[PDB]
């Protein structure tokens, strides 16, 4: 968010590399949703048909999800990684898991810091 | 009773008639020229005397090639006009056809009109019986000018109707009903179109040309009307076929179908695996989950409670479709009803028959001896 208000600050656009996953639900938007991989519920039905006439239907030009043996990711957003794209993590687990390491540097600063602490209470707290 | 090779649908007109020629003059009493709806358009049936031209299902016709509907209709017409006799003209077809009374309003009012329909009272014509099976559907036809027995047909509604449609030309050189039992016989052969299930004491197994989305889709519901359980369809589409028609297909299949095999029934220059992700799409799978699911045992069914399944090469497909069996289920080969050439790139191969699905079908008894599963396509194995 804090990129996309510079971007707006700066008066650029959103560059085309929007790119969408094997579901179509995926954009730089909601990507990050607990529901990761699996597209929503909705109303109608989801058309395969019609996905498939407006990628490119029978025009040979679509993208087809088979491994190949070649070192090339099949993957279009691992294209200009030097590796892969990084991994895919949820917006919940980033968060627990930045409070389980500012918990556990607290624990590694209360243990290398000795039992001295603004604390007076010693006995039970620190247990 | 012979049938020279011709690469096209309709041969030459010329060379058609020069063949009648040489089969009468020795070797043949009667010379039928018969052609389809596109041969008659052409002009391969136009150029010759037609003493009875009968329709037996008038619909839009080459409305693409002659560009307006009912065109072949009227070239039909046309030709039986222009070579018409008295009494000696057959104009049986369905009732329930437009075009059909169309082509019967043109043309010399003296020649014999007649209706095969099953429902319309006028044609007199009905089944009047239910003993449709997959082996033999016999109708006792209660008519005043058909026979009395009918043939057994294979499919419910399209062998019935032309079993009443040929009832009529039958009766017309001969009242008596005893004539008909060789046609009947011939009817009932499992003829190449929509061919019958295996003689072998085993479930069905059925070979079929469905090479169109409408053809399959229209298939399935003939096999589901009869089939008791569990029904497998095995196809493919044709490497630098239409594509479009790949989505769908697949779709229609596992509509209908609880468990799909599919397989590149011609690869025609173009990767096995490539053509089977773009069917795959239609049901919203990819090639790599398909194998990543296919890494684990599960192979999750669709979400509709059907099964689909995936392999590239059509033999194994095949002997996979015709070894998962039970007492009512059946087995729809939908890739090559009346053909046996099999091309991947250039090399051609005509290994792919019904042969090798009856094969299948008389070794199946190994594999259940050894204790291999075929009820999923992950095969059990012992240890």
Not at chain 1, 95 to 117: M, Q, V, Y
Not at chain 2, 29 to 53: N, P, Q, T, W, Y
Not at chain 2, 116 to 137: I, Y
């Amino acid at each position: 968010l804090e990129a996309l208000e510079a971007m707006a600050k700066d008066n650029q656009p959103i560059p085309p590399r929007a790119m969408i996953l094997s579901r179509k639900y995926r954009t730089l938007v909601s990507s990050w949703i607990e529901p990761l991989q699996e597209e929503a519920e909705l109303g109608y039905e989801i058309d395969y048909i019609a996905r498939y006439v407006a990628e490119g239907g029978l025009t040979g030009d679509r993208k087809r999800w088979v491994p190949r043996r070649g070192k090339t990711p099949l993957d279009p957003d691992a294209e200009g990684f030097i590796y892969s794209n990084p991994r895919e993590t949820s917006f919940k687990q980033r968060c627990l898991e930045e409070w389980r390491l500012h918990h556990r540097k607290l624990l590694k600063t209360l243990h290398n810091e000795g039992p001295s602490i603004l604390g007076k209470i010693s006995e039970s707290d620190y247990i | 009773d012979n049938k020279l090779e011709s690469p096209h649908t309709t041969p030459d007109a010329v060379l058609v008639q020069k063949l009648m020629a040489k089969m009468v003059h020795n070797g043949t009493e009667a010379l039928v020229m018969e052609a389809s709806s596109h041969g008659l358009a052409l002009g391969r049936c136009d150029k010759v005397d037609f003493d009875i031209a009968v329709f037996t299902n008038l619909t839009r016709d080459h409305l693409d090639f002659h560009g307006t509907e009912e065109e072949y209709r009227d070239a039909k017409a046309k030709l039986f006009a222009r070579m018409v006799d008295p009494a000696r003209h057959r104009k049986i077809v369905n009732i329930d056809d437009p075009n059909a009374a169309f082509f019967l309003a043109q043309g010399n009012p003296d020649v014999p009109i007649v209706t095969f329909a099953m429902e319309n009272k006028s044609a007199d014509v009905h089944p009047l019986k239910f003993q449709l099976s997959l082996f033999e559907t016999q109708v006792l036809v209660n008519t005043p000018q058909g026979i009395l027995e009918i043939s057994s047909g294979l499919l419910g509604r399209h062998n019935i109707y032309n079993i009443l449609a040929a009832v009529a030309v039958g009766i017309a050189v001969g009242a008596p009903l005893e004539d008909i039992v060789k046609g009947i016989e011939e009817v009932d052969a499992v003829p190449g179109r929509c061919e019958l299930i295996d003689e072998e004491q085993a479930f069905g197994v059925i070979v079929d040309y469905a090479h169109t989305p409408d053809a399959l889709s229209r298939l399935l519901d003939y096999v589901r009307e009869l089939g008791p359980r569990r029904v497998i369809t095995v196809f493919g589409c044709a490497g630098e076929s239409d594509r479009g028609k790949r989505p769908i297909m697949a779709k229609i299949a596992t509509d209908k179908s609880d468990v799909t095999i599919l397989t590149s029934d011609n690869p025609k220059t173009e990767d096995p695996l490539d053509i089977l992700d773009d069917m795959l799409a239609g049901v919203g799978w990819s090639m790599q989950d398909y194998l990543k699911h296919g890494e684990n045992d599960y192979y999750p069914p669709l979400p509709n409670g059907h099964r689909l399944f995936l392999h590239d090469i059509r033999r194994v497909a095949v002997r996979c479709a015709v070894a998962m069996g039970e007492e009512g289920d059946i087995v729809v080969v939908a890739g090559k009803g009346h053909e046996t050439y099999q091309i991947e790139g250039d090399k051609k191969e005509f290994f792919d028959d019904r042969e090798e699905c009856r094969e299948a079908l008389q070794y199946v008894d190994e594999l259940h001896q050894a204790g291999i599963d075929t009820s999923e396509f992950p095969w059990r194995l012992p240890e």
